[PDB]
Amino acid sequence: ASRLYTLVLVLQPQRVLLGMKKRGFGAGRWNGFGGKVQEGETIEDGARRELQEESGLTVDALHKVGQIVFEFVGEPELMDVHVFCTDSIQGTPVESDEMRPCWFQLDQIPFKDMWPDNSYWFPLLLQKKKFHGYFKFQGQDTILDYTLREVDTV
């Protein structure tokens, strides 16, 4: 019982792009860009499509960096999130009614205003490590338990 999602982190040498979501699941929190994968669409093509829909940016080179499964207690479907990273993009981040993008210096990533799992695996993403994670949430703020291990192959 799992549903495919994407998450794209535009990660440059000294800064990362994040978006403040206006409404929906995760509203009020900085996050990477992504969403559901469509029928007949590859996960990577879905990640590319969502990056543009939400941030206005066109990615060229995308790299798999992680897989994180999210469980919310009481909700049947697990979120199977395929995480990607890129440095080579085109365009300028676009603010829309749905999303407010902002660049952050790497020592100023706003973990307090992000999903609480991010502080666990971001240190790996910033050091170019690949990972497999699982986070069991109660509600949207409480991590009941988790696993996170590095991998050589996502």
Ligand SMILES: Nc1nc2ncccc2[nH]1
């Ligand atoms: N970046 C990010 N973390 C998350 N945790 C739970 C649900 C969705 C999430 N998106």
